[PDB]
Amino acid sequence: ARDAYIAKPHNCVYECYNPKGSYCNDLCTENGAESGYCQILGKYGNACWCIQLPDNVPIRIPGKCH
């Protein structure tokens, strides 16, 4: 596993509104992630960051979203 932005339906980033909370963290673990946090230094703005995410879960890629 590794750390990165969690992908969503479809191929979209998970924008976090509560950076000072466990918003992204909880959502991250929801996909089998160990942890997560709101990332501000994102090329696409605020993206949900996940720590120790399994290669089984999709990540934010340079593609078009739904």
The answer to whether residues 15 and 46 touch, using CB atoms and an 8 Å cutoff, is yes
Residue 10: cis peptide before it, omega within 30 degrees of 0: yes
Q: What are phi and psi of 25, to 5 degrees?
A: -55, -55
Method: NMR
Indicate which CATH number applies to the domain containing 44: 3.30.30.10
Q: Which domain holds residue 60?
A: 1-66
Report CA dihedral (30, 35, 37, 41) to the nearest 10 degrees.
-110
Alpha carbons 37 and 64: distance in angstroms, whole number: 24
The angle at the Cα of 55, spanning 52 to 56, to the nearest 5 degrees, equals 115
- Please tell me the total count of domains within the chain: 1
